[PDB]
Design a binder for this molecule. Structure first.
Ligand SMILES: *CCN(CC[C@H](N)C(=O)O)C[C@H]1O[C@@H](n2cnc3c(N)ncnc32)[C@H](O)[C@@H]1O
Lengths: 117, 141, 235, 58
RNA sequence: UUUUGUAUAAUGGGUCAGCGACUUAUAUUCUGUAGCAAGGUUAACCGAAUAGGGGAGCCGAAGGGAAACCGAGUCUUAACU
RNA sequence: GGUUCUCCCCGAAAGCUAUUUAGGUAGCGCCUCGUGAAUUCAUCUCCGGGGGUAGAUGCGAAUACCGGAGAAUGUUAUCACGGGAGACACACGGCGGGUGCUAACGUCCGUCGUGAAGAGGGAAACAACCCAGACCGCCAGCUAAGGUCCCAAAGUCAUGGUUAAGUGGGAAACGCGGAAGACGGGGCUAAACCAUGCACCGAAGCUGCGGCAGCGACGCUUAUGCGUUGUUGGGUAGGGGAGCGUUCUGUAAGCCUG
RNA sequence: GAACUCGCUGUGAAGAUGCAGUGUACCCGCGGCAAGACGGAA
């Protein structure tokens, strides 16, 4: 029972070659390097899925410090006063109301400064 | 929902005037590089600059603490060859403002965005500036 | 190998060595003991280094009547020399590991009196002021040639003649307060990038102050005058 | 008698097998894992067996 | 790919499509499953031929001492606890 | 030298003893699947000790062992048999004994950690250096090693001293007295060193939410399926289990299809 | 094998276009030279 294997190998090659569209030159035309390109892209995605949570937290911390420095109080003392005042607001939406609001951030800074002093 | 980002065609930047008579070199250059990057604004984003234009005058009166006026040495290579070596005193006596610029070039990031940020700084060696039409503001540092 | 007695093809080499009865002698490579048998007699105390143990038993069989010596079964390039007191080096070495001894005795040893026998080509090249190795070699120790030993004396016949080198410590005054520019100077000198060490004016003036008329034939005191010129030009 | 809180504060990477067997007999698995014990001289022997790695609370 | 281990200073691939590598027969041991059960099972051959006949043979239900011979025990052990 | 589809569990070694033994052979030690068994085994404490390691090497502790008793913890982690292999030139460092001149960032035996078969963070880069074992997803929080002037996330923070040398910004003998190539850059007189205290940044470590998978103990029950409940899930060679796809044959003078 | 194929400092299975720091360099050609590299063993 001889079986020809023309359809299966062509479908397997076309499945991989469809995942490598938009690559420079011979990395998007031949199979022997598109396989390695797909593997390396998957590994880089798997690492950057962890790196994204560090990058966005660093951006939020920089924005929080830049917004809090205008009212005459550093980032560390502001966070320590907020923790001593028992406020459970996280770094993302606090930076969001720091960007998109000014009176509420001023009231929050005054509350933290009153709680620390 | 996504966090806010700063569009480059809608942000606002102002003008400031910084005096440099008797101020320390590094302790002024650090503040200038921090203000040029846009790190003092709530809309700070790393991939697009948001800094303000800064005019520095009286740049030949900058003082350095210690004995660095005779032993601080600047080297420069032509890219071939021979090297050009100078000290502080003949460099301020020849071209003063370059020294301040060199300090800013030591502190800003590298790449196209670094020189794009460095373009915003204008340093004058005298006391008169011709940018009075832009209506600058006096900043104390 | 290249060992041999021939007895009278020896005393004749055993004259120039002006050794006295109070010297401490370290000898590199004994063979069968044609030299150590009088090295125990003409000096005070001998500490020989030999790695071939059957040759060591041959040496003990030749030297049953001597007590002021010991033999160490240690490898030459792994042996660490004593760092106190004073002694002299005598050497009859194999050639196919010759460089491996010489940087051992000028950079990892503090011996001041060196008697070695090498081949003609090595003795000729070691005094050549072009190679970087030789420029490192006379950095601390003066080099001199005594006489020639042709090849008919070594039983396994060699192909080229041999020669005696006598090397003396000159106190150098190139040390930790002077160095880390000397390797710079020679390693930029032997491959000819003069622009990284001098400009045109200082190079021409140092040549006219030194008195060098041909760059291909430069002597050592000329080289230290050049290094002094570089030191005065570079603070 | 009086109950004792036991807390692990550092890991067991590159330690002797005696310390690992002590942790196995104590009932500690990871950093921050608290456990309850009763007062016994044997328990105090386990405590002084590894004093730099666990934390006691009376 | 070889090495304890490699961008290293050890080797191989220009690209695409097709072809290309644990199989067969006979003995032997073990595992899962099905029929029968102190019994199981046929070969060559005959045969309107996957039906039926053919018990010629093969494995087991009782052992060990070389042995004669002894036995649910025997055998060896001077003989056993 | 090569050997072609996928997933789920467990997962090592480069050692030992003997030989017409020199590229060898036979057992033991390491791994996995099936069966049974003794409160089987491990850590700790106590008890009088088999030897001779404090106090006082003449008696003899902790640490290299052995014996009994006992509480707690540990998915039997313990032993025997049968089926199936892999490995048989390891590398670096540590502890207790040797060698070498306690010569020399010198060399051998029993034992351990890291890689081989381990991802991440820090020391600029860097296999053995310090912390720390990756089921998957989240634009949530707390921490270890290391840091808080700009490059680059966080104290130009507080208290009391030291240095004037750019020492800091590298170490070997002791000469402000030989110490001098290795701050990453800018550049600093505190943004260097010592001591104290209070915060913060800081990983794939821990916690918060959702989902899948294996092995246990519970109630209904039963083609053994649900509902609580603890617990685990990096991995080369190797062992075990569950599946996808291609050709032909019976079901098939059936089904779809100008 | 695929390339969008620069110079110095240091780490290096030990002479780095790809590593960390720093500097220079608008895109593309055309006639040369030997230095890198292939022939060469310093
Ligand atoms: C492989 C050849 N050697 C030596 C051969 C000899 N130089 C010749 O005539 O070809 C070359 C290497 O040895 C060095 N070298 C130069 N001169 C000598 C002498 N006299 N003795 C030993 N070695 C020598 C060369 O620089 C080269 O490294």
């Amino acid at each position: 029972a001889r079986v020809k294997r023309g359809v299966i190998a062509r479908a397997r090659h076309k499945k991989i070659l469809k995942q490598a569209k938009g690559y420079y030159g011979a990395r998007s035309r031949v199979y022997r390097v598109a396989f390695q390109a797909v593997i390396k892209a998957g590994q880089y995605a798997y690492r950057d899925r962890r790196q994204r949570k560090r990058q966005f937290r660093q951006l939020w911390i920089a924005r929080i410090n830049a917004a809090a420095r205008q009212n005459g109080i550093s980032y560390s003392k502001f966070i320590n006063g907020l923790k001593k005042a028992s406020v459970e607001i996280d770094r993302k939406i606090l930076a969001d109301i720091a960007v998109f609001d000014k009176v509420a951030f001023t009231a929050l800074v005054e509350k933290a400064k009153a709680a620390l002093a | 929902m996504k966090t806010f980002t700063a569009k480059p065609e809608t942000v606002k930047r102002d003008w400031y005037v910084v005096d440099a008579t008797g101020k320390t070199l590094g302790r002024l250059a650090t503040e200038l590089a921090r203000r040029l990057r846009g790190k003092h604004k709530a809309e700070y984003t790393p991939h697009v600059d948001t800094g303000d234009y800064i005019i520095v005058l009286n740049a030949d009166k900058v003082a350095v603490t210690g004995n660095k006026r005779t032993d601080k040495v600047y080297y420069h290579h032509t890219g071939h060859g021979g090297i050009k070596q100078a000290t502080f005193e003949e460099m301020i006596a020849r071209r003063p403002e370059r020294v301040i610029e060199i300090a800013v070039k030591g502190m800003l990031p590298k790449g196209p965005l670094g020189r794009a940020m460095f373009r915003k700084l204008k340093v004058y060696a005298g006391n008169e500036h011709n940018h009075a039409a832009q209506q600058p503001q006096v900043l104390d540092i | 190998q290249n060992f041999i007695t021939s007895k009278h093809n020896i005393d004749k080499i055993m004259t120039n060595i002006r050794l006295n009865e109070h010297d401490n002698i370290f000898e590199i490579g004994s063979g069968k003991g044609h030299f150590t048998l009088e090295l125990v007699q003409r000096c005070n105390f001998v500490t020989a280094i030999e790695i071939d143990h059957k040759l060591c038993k041959t040496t003990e069989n030749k030297l049953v009547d001597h007590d002021n010596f010991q033999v160490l079964n240690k490898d030459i390039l792994q042996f660490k020399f004593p760092k106190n007191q004073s002694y002299k080096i005598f050497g009859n070495i194999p050639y196919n590991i010759s460089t491996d001894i010489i940087r051992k005795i000028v950079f990892d040893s503090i011996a001041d009196e060196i008697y070695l026998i090498v081949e003609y080509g090595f003795a000729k090249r070691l005094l050549n002021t072009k190679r970087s190795l030789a420029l490192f070699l006379m950095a601390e120790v003066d080099i001199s040639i005594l006489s020639m030993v042709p090849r008919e004396y070594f039983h396994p016949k060699p192909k080229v003649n041999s020669s005696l080198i006598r090397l003396n410590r000159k106190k150098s005054r190139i040390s930790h307060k002077d160095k880390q520019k000397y390797n710079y100077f020679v390693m930029k000198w032997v491959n000819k990038e003069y622009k990284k060490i001098f400009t045109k004016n200082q190079f021409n003036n140092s040549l006219k102050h030194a008195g060098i008329d041909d760059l291909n034939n430069i002597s050592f005191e000329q080289f230290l005058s050049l290094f002094n010129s570089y030191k005065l030009f570079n603070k | 008698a009086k109950t004792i809180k036991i807390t692990q504060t550092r890991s067991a990477i590159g330690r002797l097998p005696k310390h690992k067997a002590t942790l196995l007999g104590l009932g500690l698995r990871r950093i921050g894992h608290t456990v309850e014990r009763e007062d016994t001289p044997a328990i105090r022997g386990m405590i002084n067996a590894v004093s730099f790695m666990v934390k006691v609370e009376e």
